[PDB]
Amino acid sequence: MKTLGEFIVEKQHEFSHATGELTALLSAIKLGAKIIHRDINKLDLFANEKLKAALKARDIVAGIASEEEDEIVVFEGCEHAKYVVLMDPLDGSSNIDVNVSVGTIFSIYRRVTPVGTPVTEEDFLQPGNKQVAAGYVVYGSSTMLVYTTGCGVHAFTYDPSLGVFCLCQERMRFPEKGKTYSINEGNYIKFPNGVKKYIKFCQEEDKSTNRPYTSRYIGSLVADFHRNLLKGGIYLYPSTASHPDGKLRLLYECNPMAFLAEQAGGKASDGKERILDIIPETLHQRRSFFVGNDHMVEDVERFIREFPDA
Amino acid sequence: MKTLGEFIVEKQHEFSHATGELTALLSAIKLGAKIIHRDINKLDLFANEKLKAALKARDIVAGIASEEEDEIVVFEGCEHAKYVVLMDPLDGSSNIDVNVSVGTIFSIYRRVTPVGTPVTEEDFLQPGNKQVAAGYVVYGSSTMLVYTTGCGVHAFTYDPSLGVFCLCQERMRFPEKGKTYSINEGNYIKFPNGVKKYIKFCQEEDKSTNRPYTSRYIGSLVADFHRNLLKGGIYLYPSTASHPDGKLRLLYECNPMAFLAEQAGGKASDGKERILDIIPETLHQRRSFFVGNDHMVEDVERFIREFPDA
Amino acid sequence: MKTLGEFIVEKQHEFSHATGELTALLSAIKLGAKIIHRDINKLDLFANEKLKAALKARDIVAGIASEEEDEIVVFEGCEHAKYVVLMDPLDGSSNIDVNVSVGTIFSIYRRVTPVGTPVTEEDFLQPGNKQVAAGYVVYGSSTMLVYTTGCGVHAFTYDPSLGVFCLCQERMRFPEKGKTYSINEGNYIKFPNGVKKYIKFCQEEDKSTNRPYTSRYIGSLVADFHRNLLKGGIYLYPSTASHPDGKLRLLYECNPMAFLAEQAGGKASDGKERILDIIPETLHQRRSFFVGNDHMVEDVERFIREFPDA
Amino acid sequence: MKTLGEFIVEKQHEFSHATGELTALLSAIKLGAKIIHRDINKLDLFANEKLKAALKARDIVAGIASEEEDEIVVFEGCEHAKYVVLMDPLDGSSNIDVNVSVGTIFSIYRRVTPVGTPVTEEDFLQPGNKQVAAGYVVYGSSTMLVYTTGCGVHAFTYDPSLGVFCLCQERMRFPEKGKTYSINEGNYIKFPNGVKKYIKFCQEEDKSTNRPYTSRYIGSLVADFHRNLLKGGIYLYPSTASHPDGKLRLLYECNPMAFLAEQAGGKASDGKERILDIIPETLHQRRSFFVGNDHMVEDVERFIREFPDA
């Protein structure tokens, strides 16, 4: 058995050789995860407060931005720190009422503003390709932490009896092919024409390409993403008239998940371009999101090009 | 706070006033659930063995039938018992690999054969309407036990820190209307014509009836059933050319879930008739299954009558 | 592995064949123990309230008497019950501050007053020889439950990860000889002359009788008793000028521990007579207490006869 | 609430400002403690192996010396490390069988031999006054970690439900006076004359100095030490004919506990001189040990000077 802390020390080459700093960052995340885990066994504010407090206590983060706050949070006494963290404290918290998987998503960037000064929104509006780390905690049948710093995706499972996260998968990679699609198909009529055509494509009979595909939609970004990463597949959250530019948050959800997806050998697109290369406009900016096996995301992109209407 | 054990003693009117016996039965189930819970934090055989051992140790069950065994199990030294239990020890165990919800389903009947003799398959082939109890354990973000003895559906949540199941919902009831459907829509082309038509019906635009409906499919009978019970909805597992008479087991899955559904004010059909009234043919008999809010199941039945082809 | 509940069902010959009732009684105790266990990982009132509530919820106890209450507690709606329980909810609670072992002690009697009426102090003032059950829960490095119903002493260890008590010792018996004594020797000068002489006797050099004996005094009746039961020894709590008739409670501590000691093959005396045969005078009556290996208790009794002064 | 990890980061002035290193060291200890904690809820080898593995995995310790090994252990690939650790993996493991408190003791030194080379016994034979850190983990009714780096004694309690150690006492100090003594008084006749005289002194009647003192002897160095630190007192483990120079290990037990005692305002002597100033002769060297409130240890020293015979 190898714990998360031991694994970090082992891979002192990742995170720009900043091992001590990564240990601190993930220790704050693991602490918040443990607190949230027990609390699950409203919660949004709770998770937000605990994670925020955990990060501030490590004296390594200058400030944070959260889906649960309109404005960024500048930590007093941490202006010397060079890291900022963006997070979705409790992804899909609505699933708590029905005992369905929920999760925490985090994204880490090196600040751009001068150290020793208060971080500004400029530090939080960098494109996803600037992330130095990203990950999620999935609170399902078991609690797991998955992260990347640009050198592969690593998975750890929390052992409640030992109170520690244990390594369970060092190099998480999408399988060569995907055969599952995840989307709220009930909203079929509301989706762009290209997405509707792709859904029909998924239902055709073609054994040579494993079609029709299997459908799976838990309704939790983290849970669906996690399953598709392990078994192969694609997750889709298109735009609709109600959400013309998508529903998912570009900064708190799309970017970190896109970083993880790419590090696992997958693709993350908004239907037309690479998520990680999008220039952020606002903290709460939304974006259409298609992520998973590259061939599947490529198919969605093709259908959107062939049937451009919304 | 009120524990499962205390609740049972409180409702000494249920289970034909056989309080001591119900306590014994659920104690065996709770024990097995606790063991399985920790083991999750292959498993099929494990869950089967632990539950079987737990039931035998309570000296109240003459024998059991399990999805994990071709033949029934007659407990030596328990021929004096008048109860038999049928179970699906670990529903959707495949979801374990992806950290998705799994569950245990149990069904209890009073034997028909003379006490003091070895139970036979006759005791396990009674129609669902003869069940004296049924329930499930859902191992999700939290572990919960749900059951009925014919007087409503009661829910309990396991508190790992106290090692006990606590009452969380005394009268589980489907809401007045459902607005969510759960099916592997990827297999659309393989389903009977009536089911295909119903799926399209679910996607129409009609705000007056909350359409289009929301789609949710975890891929776990227990997990999807549980969510739909709390929020309203319908779960569908139709027949296909590969499984002409459905995939779900009539005795280990359909009957117990149908009993729970009806006790919560819902409906459980195979598309044409009431699940609980079907006369069992074999231990492993399969059946098409549609369960949830009555109006939704009624709609499926109508579409099947209007479009009868497979 | 065999759980406490399964063990009880197995030994349906004990407790006057009242298996269902014993299960109920110990279930209340185990529940209270679990609650207290987690709360430890002031407390007196807490432990008292939780245990009292647990016993009342099982609808099998007419009332209780506790070291934490001047008057007995008559449970409304339980006048039909035939059992009464006396308890020391949190023995040696002062040890909590220093992380030292503490414990719960319980004693069970069949009421003497007519069923269907409110129990009176008469039901709680019966001599110890009338106990139908007695036991303790020791909250130490691990939490254990030990009990007897007149057919030997059985020990169970709580497994926090499974949330259940597991059998660890079916027939607890004092070894053939004891070689350890447990007393607050600091109060040597305050003890009766016979006790002082016995202490000196314990310190003599005589390998043939394993002397000098080893001294061990945790300061917790339950913890010291438990160790001496497993390894052999004697526990002494004599009278002093401050407590002329002893400090320990005859009904809440001495009687239940004496029942356990005798069932394990040991002896329990007040220095002159058998604890279980003493006729109670009041609910809070105190008594000198010497318990453990028979030969050691016999030695104390001899010294008290030979040196009678206080 | 403040965790051990957060506390360490907070006090970045201690441990020669080597915060990152202290975090690593205590993380290894906390991990081992968690593993041992669950294993308790033979063990000597287990505890030794887990702690040794934990320390090696942090890549910060060049090697260790343990009471469970005749020779020191040089960690391959850690010759670059500048710290060495000495430990008593499972103090009083015999108490496990009786559910009595046990503990882990650790001592940390900066190596004296050149970095980049294999540590030798020279690195492990430094006097106690050279320790840079020392501490213990007490596995009792609750699990606690206590440590010092020369700036006071800090206590933390393990919360099994959160899987983390929480600060509970920042500045542990002996009370102004002690009124409890801890010794195996059964061996009175075997002790040096001065110790026998001190024991009698403890039993005299003198309210002005809180005498007679209370006696408490759990039989576990860590447990007795911990209680005396919180409530005041003295722990004595004298020499005897069987152990002419004491029984406790100078390096694995006496030195670390002496460092803690002094940092809490107490005293630690072998009866004649300061434990921390003794020049080690061998890895397994033993020593008489008297530790606790200064006035009490001073009294023992006086009696030993006044009655010098063994």
Q: Residue D251's closest CA among D283, D217, D220, D209?
A: D283
Q: At what angle do helices A193-202 and A294-306 cross, to 10 degrees?
A: 130
Task: Name the token pair of D53.
Answer: 């593995």
Measure the N-to-C terminal CA separation of chain D; round to a whole number of Å: 51
Closest residue in A to D21 (Cα) is A20
Given resolution (angstroms): 1.5
d(CA D156, CA D221): 19
B161 and C CB contact within 8 Å: yes
Do C191 and C162 have their domain in common? no
DSSP B250: I
For residue D74, what is the enclosing H or E element?
strand D73-74
Q: Which residues pair with B75 in a beta bridge?
A: none
Strand bridging mode B73-74 / A289-292: unpaired
Task: Tell which A residues from 87 to 116 touch B, by Cβ distance under 8 Å.
Answer: 95-102
User: Is the Cβ pair C31, B5 closer than 8 Å?
Assistant: yes
A41 and C CB contact within 8 Å: no
Do B268 and B291 have their domain in common? yes
Domain boundary among A171, A194, A219: A171
Do B270 and B191 have their domain in common? yes
Backbone CA torsion sign across C106, C108, C111, C117: positive
d(CA C149, CA C126): 16
b (16+ CB within 10 A) / e for B285-303: bbbbbbbbbbbbbebbbeb
**Is the Cβ–Cβ distance between A106 and B147 less than 8 Å?**
no
Do C123 and C194 have their domain in common? no
For residue A40, the domain's CATH number is 3.30.540.10
User: Is the Cβ pair A140, B188 closer than 8 Å?
Assistant: no
Residues 6+ apart with CB under 8 A from C16: C132
Closest residue in A to B189 (Cα) is A203
Do A20 and A164 have their domain in common? yes
Task: Name the token pair of A187.
Answer: 């909203």
Do B47 and B63 have their domain in common? yes
Partners of D204 on chain C (C-beta within 8 Å) are 189
Do A12 and A154 have their domain in common? yes
d(CA C151, CA C129): 14
- DSSP of D205-259, one letter per residue? -BGGGTBSPEE-B-S-HHHHHHHHHHH--EEEE---SSSBTBSSBIIIIIHHHHH
d(CA C29, CA C143): 13
Strands (E), chain A: 61-66, 73-74, 83-91, 102-110, 133-139, 143-148, 153-159, 164-172, 180-182, 214-215, 234-237, 267-269, 289-292
Q: How far, in Å, are C196, D13, D14, D133 from residue D26 at the CA level?
A: 48, 16, 13, 10
D59 and A CB contact within 8 Å: yes
Task: Name the token pair of D74.
Answer: 């040089």
Please tell me whether residue A108 adopts helix, strand or coil conformation: strand
Nearest CA-CA distance, residue D86 and chain C, Å: 24
A34 and B CB contact within 8 Å: no
SS3 of D151-169: the string is CCEEEEEEECCCCEEEEEE
Nearest CA-CA distance, residue A132 and chain D, Å: 21
d(CA C167, CA C9): 13
Range of the domain at C279: 173-310
Do D187 and D306 have their domain in common? yes
Q: Residue C229's closest CA among C189, C187, C182, C195?
A: C182
Chains near C, with 3+ CB pairs < 8 A?
Answer: A, B, D
For residue B104, what is the enclosing H or E element?
strand B102-110
SS3 of B190-224: the string is HCCHHHHHHHHHHCCCEHHHCECCEECECCCHHHH
Domain boundary among B125, B141, B171: B171
B41 and D CB contact within 8 Å: no
Residues 6+ apart with CB under 8 A from B203: A185, A186, A188, A189, B211, B212, B213
**Is the Cβ–Cβ distance between A143 and A259 less than 8 Å?**
no
Chains near A, with 3+ CB pairs < 8 A?
Answer: B, C, D
Please tell me whether residue D2 adopts helix, strand or coil conformation: coil
B217 and A CB contact within 8 Å: yes
Task: Name the token pair of B254.
Answer: 């359909």
C208 and D CB contact within 8 Å: no
Do A179 and A196 have their domain in common? yes
Among candidates D2, D38, D164 on the partner chain, residue whose Cβ is nearest the Cβ of A34:
D164
Helices (H) and strands (E) counted in chain B, each on its own, are: 8, 13
d(CA A270, CA A291): 9
Tally C-beta pairs within 8 A across A and B.
135
Among candidates A142, A160, A212 on the partner chain, residue whose Cβ is nearest the Cβ of B99:
A142
d(CA D158, CA D162): 8
**Is the Cβ–Cβ distance between A91 and A253 less than 8 Å?**
yes
Task: Name the token pair of A194.
Answer: 């290209």
DSSP D16: G
d(CA D74, CA D121): 10
Q: Residue B217's closest CA among D188, A199, A100, C36?
A: A100
Do C91 and C207 have their domain in common? no
Q: Residue D216's closest CA among C92, C196, C40, C197?
A: C92
Nearest CA-CA distance, residue B158 and chain A, Å: 8
SS3 of chain C: the string is CCEHHHHHHHCCCCHHHCHHHHHHHHHHHHHHHHHHHHHHCCHHHHHHHHHHHHHHHCCCEEEEEECCCCCCEECCCCCCCCEEEEEEEEECHHHHHHCCCEEEEEEEEECCCCCCCCCCHHHHCCCHHHCCEEEEEEECCCEEEEEECCCCEEEEEEECCCCEEEEEEEEECCCCCCCEEECCHHHHHHCCHHHHHHHHHHCCCEHHHCECCEECECCCHHHHHHHHHHHCCEEEECCCCCCECECCEHHHHHHHHHHHHHHCCCEEECCCCEHHHCCCCCCCCECCEEEECHHHHHHHHHHHHHCCCC
Please tell me whether residue D75 adopts helix, strand or coil conformation: coil
Q: Residue C113's closest CA among C82, C144, C136, C139?
A: C82
Please tell me whether residue D104 adopts helix, strand or coil conformation: strand
**How many domains is chain D partitioned into structurally?**
2
d(CA D19, CA A226): 36
Task: Name the token pair of B96.
Answer: 């374990």
Closest residue in D to C98 (Cα) is D227
Do D284 and D229 have their domain in common? yes
Task: Name the token pair of D220.
Answer: 């576990």
Task: Name the token pair of B305.
Answer: 């009558």
Domain boundary among C108, C141, C171: C171
Do C143 and C18 have their domain in common? yes
Method: X-ray
Closest residue in B to C159 (Cα) is B163
User: Is the Cβ pair C226, D142 closer than 8 Å?
Assistant: no
d(CA D165, CA D161): 11
Strands (E), B140-285: 143-148, 153-159, 164-172, 180-182, 214-215, 234-237, 267-269
Partners of A160 on chain B (C-beta within 8 Å) are 41, 160
For residue A257, the domain's CATH number is 3.40.190.80
